[PDB]
Amino acid sequence: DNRHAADYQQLRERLIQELNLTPQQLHEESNLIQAGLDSIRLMRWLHWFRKNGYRLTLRELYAAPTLAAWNQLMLSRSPE
Numbered sequence: 001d002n003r004h005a006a007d008y009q010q011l012r013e014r015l016i017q018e019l020n021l022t023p024q025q026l027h028e029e030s031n032l033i034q035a036g037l038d039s040i041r042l043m044r045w046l047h048w049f050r051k052n053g054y055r056l057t058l059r060e061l062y063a064a065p066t067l068a069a070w071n072q073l074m075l076s077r078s079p080e
Ligand SMILES: *P(=O)(O)OCC(C)(C)[C@@H](O)C(=O)NCCC(=O)NCCSC(=O)c1ccccc1O
Pocket: 037, 038, 039, 040, 042, 043, 058, 062
């Protein structure tokens, strides 16, 4: 399978570090932009997973800010 999808696990955990909350109290079905998530965090994300060959632009992440959709945006997104 895609072993790099584990990068999502570190993603999920990483927001928690900045959000100062537990990985249980995060809403991946709700919008993460409802939490303390600015664009520098967001632009960081692109670059951060891009190193594993993840391809996505900025706006799909904004359109559906949910890890549920972001995981799709990671693995396939839609090529480039
Ligand atoms: P961030 O706010 O700095 O956003 C960085 C982007 C928008 C990707 C850059 O293009 C940029 O040069 N900075 C513009 C900063 C600014 O004034 N804010 C615009 C945000 S538009 C948007 O869709 C968005 C993105 C992320 C968080 C909140 C938000 O409203």
